[PDB]
């Protein structure tokens, strides 16, 4: 699998007349997230980052005909692109557990999944034996939230006067109910003034400076372990 793959044990709901009336599935999603604290059974994911070298692939249908004993590629073509296979993933909605309360979550969009059948061992070079950890109770920094009023679609406009986070369809409705509220200045969501953030290698106090050799934020206690401390 080259691309976006799904991992079991993750909050992963659905993106998005007589089909939209089942919108209550998102309301039940947020009901279940608040009803149960989710350790989510964090796991022992042991993966092999294989540098799979595919090349000059022939387009092939699902896996049952790309099985080695029934296709028999030439020496030019070297892999088989499974066109109508894999899953081709989806999805925005995902709970976050921001600080001490629940939210949502609009994950990164524009996904794919392209699967290639490789038939000889020298096209696969294992590189790293990655042991990694997936826990839903940690922070999810890809954290586009929804409209406060409409509680629905992903917000992309922040009115600093209104102190509310809004998507386009609700944001028009915020400013038309009165003549007075039409003239609120409307900055997009972008990078609203929120904070600068406390340090991660030790909590409590916020970042103050910048490093510029290894590009990372520097706090007041951080320059001592910085070897170049000036830049």
């Amino acid at each position: 699998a080259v691309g976006n793959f799904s991992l079991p044990g993750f909050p992963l709901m659905r993106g998005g007349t007589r089909q939209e009336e089942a919108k209550k599935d998102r309301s039940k999603f947020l009901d279940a997230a608040r009803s149960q604290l989710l350790t989510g059974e964090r796991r022992i994911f042991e993966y092999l980052l294989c540098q799979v070298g595919v090349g000059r692939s022939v387009v092939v249908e699902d896996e049952k005909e790309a099985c080695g004993s029934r296709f028999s590629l030439l020496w030019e073509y070297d892999s088989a692109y499974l066109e109508k296979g894999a899953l081709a993933p989806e999805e925005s909605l995902t709970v976050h557990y921001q600080a001490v309360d629940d939210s949502k979550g609009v994950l990164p969009q524009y996904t794919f999944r392209h699967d290639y059948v490789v038939y000889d061992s020298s096209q696969v070079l294992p590189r790293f034996f990655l042991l990694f950890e997936m826990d839903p109770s940690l922070e999810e920094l890809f954290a586009v939230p929804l409209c406060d009023n409409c509680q629905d679609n992903p917000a992309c406009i922040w009115c600093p006067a209104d102190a509310a986070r809004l998507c386009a369809s609700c944001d028009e409705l915020i400013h038309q109910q009165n003549r007075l509220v039409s003239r609120h200045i409307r900055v997009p969501l972008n990078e609203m003034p929120r904070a600068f953030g406390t340090c991660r290698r030790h909590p409590g106090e916020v970042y103050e400076l910048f490093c510029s050799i290894c590009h990372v934020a520097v706090c007041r206690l951080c320059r001592g372990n910085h070897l170049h401390a000036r830049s």
Binding site: V59, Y81, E83, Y110, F112, H114
Partner: peptide
């Protein structure tokens, strides 16, 4: 959104049966 978009979804289907 933010460039990309219309060129991403057109070459997502790399099987050139056109």
């Amino acid at each position: 959104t933010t460039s990309s978009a219309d060129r991403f979804d057109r070459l997502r289907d790399i099987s050139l049966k056109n």
